[PDB]
């Protein structure tokens, strides 16, 4: 990850992680990775503007002991290149909930059954400006 | 260390790092470390409420290639246990400038001559709630 990497987050169920960043004006893609560590991700969150044969599609996946799971593709894309976006993430036993710009929301199963999020990494065309824990 | 650890900050000269956190009601001390990595710190910032013989004193130092430099104490102590505190940090070639609650500002010489600040770690009796880069 070229972007910010943070560990020892100690984010517990029902706590809200808010991340605000700048989307590059020539953005192709960006990634937010969340989990225990780099090899154990409960959420790989990958908005693709124009990358890997995908246009304006959010792709999500998990990684378990180094092995990627099966990707899920979402139905909404409320990001624009060249703009500031905020993403809010919370989790419980069964699901991660991601709240996006403009009132959009989706869920992704908690496949690792993690009880804390301790690692966050960003990559691609997204510059983090603010991180907050509520 | 036990607190938040962040890398790839890419904080450049003139940019502001703002960190806000909760100081435990029974706080003895907390640490914020900034630099390149855990062996190369341009600033080790250590408010002692009651620790290692010292009361209501800010200790600062650097660490270069694993070796602690010459420690310095500041006279002002604008922290209270059991409250929220924000510290703002910026640097240039000559100095770090640390702005504290209640308006107090001090400079600490930049002994490492780093191009950017890429590493931050918090430790002790301070829970990070928000970090911002501008
Ligand atoms: C001269 O002893 C050292 O002085 C140094 C400054 O010159 C450091 O402050 C160091 O403490 C620490 O690195 C540290 C780390 C974590 C926490 C919670 C507290 C202190 C240590 O102080 C002592 C006594 O450890």
UniProtKB/Swiss-Prot annotation, chains A, B:
InterPro entries: ConA-like_dom_sf, Galectin-like, Galectin_CRD. Homodimer. Binds LGALS3BP. Interacts with CD2, CD3, CD4, CD6, CD7, CD43, ALCAM and CD45. Interacts with laminin (via poly-N-acetyllactosamine). Interacts with SUSD2. Interacts with cargo receptor TMED10; the interaction mediates the translocation from the cytoplasm into the ERGIC (endoplasmic reticulum-Golgi intermediate compartment) and thereby secretion. Interacts with CD69. The lineage of its organism: Eukaryota, Metazoa, Chordata, Craniata, Vertebrata. It is found in: Secreted, Extracellular space, Extracellular matrix; Cytoplasm; Secreted. GO terms for cellular component: collagen-containing extracellular matrix; cytoplasm; cytosol; endoplasmic reticulum lumen; extracellular exosome; extracellular region; extracellular space; galectin complex. GO terms for biological process: apoptotic process; cell-cell adhesion; myoblast differentiation; negative regulation of T-helper 17 cell lineage commitment; plasma cell differentiation; positive regulation of apoptotic process; positive regulation of canonical NF-kappaB signal transduction; positive regulation of inflammatory response. Keywords: Acetylation, Apoptosis, Cytoplasm, Extracellular matrix, Lectin, Phosphoprotein, Secreted. This is Galectin-1. The modification N-acetylalanine is found at residue 1. A beta-D-galactoside binds at residues 44-48, 52, 61, 68-71. The keyword Membrane does not apply. The modification N6-succinyllysine is found at residue 107. It comes from Homo sapiens (Human). Lectin that binds beta-galactoside and a wide array of complex carbohydrates. Plays a role in regulating apoptosis, cell proliferation and cell differentiation. Inhibits CD45 protein phosphatase activity and therefore the dephosphorylation of Lyn kinase. Strong inducer of T-cell apoptosis. Plays a negative role in Th17 cell differentiation via activation of the receptor CD69. Gene3D superfamilies: 2.60.120.200. Expressed in placenta, maternal decidua and fetal membranes. Within placenta, expressed in trophoblasts, stromal cells, villous endothelium, syncytiotrophoblast apical membrane and villous stroma. Within fetal membranes, expressed in amnion, chorioamniotic mesenchyma and chorion (at protein level). Expressed in cardiac, smooth, and skeletal muscle, neurons, thymus, kidney and hematopoietic cells.
């Amino acid at each position: 990850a070229c972007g910010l990497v943070a560990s020892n987050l100690n984010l517990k169920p029902g706590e809200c992680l808010r991340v605000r960043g700048e989307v590059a004006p020539d953005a192709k893609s960006f990634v937010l990775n969340l989990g225990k560590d780099s090899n154990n991700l409960c959420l790989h969150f990958n908005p693709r503007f124009n990358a890997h044969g995908d246009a304006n599609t959010i792709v999500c996946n998990s990684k378990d002991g180094g092995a990627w799971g099966t990707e899920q593709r979402e139905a909404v894309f409320p990001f624009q290149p060249g703009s500031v976006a905020e993403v809010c993430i919370t989790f419980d036993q069964a699901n991660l909930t991601v709240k996006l710009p403009d009132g959009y929301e989706f869920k992704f199963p908690n496949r690792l059954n993690l009880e804390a999020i301790n690692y966050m990494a960003a990559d691609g065309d997204f510059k983090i400006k603010c991180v907050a824990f509520d």
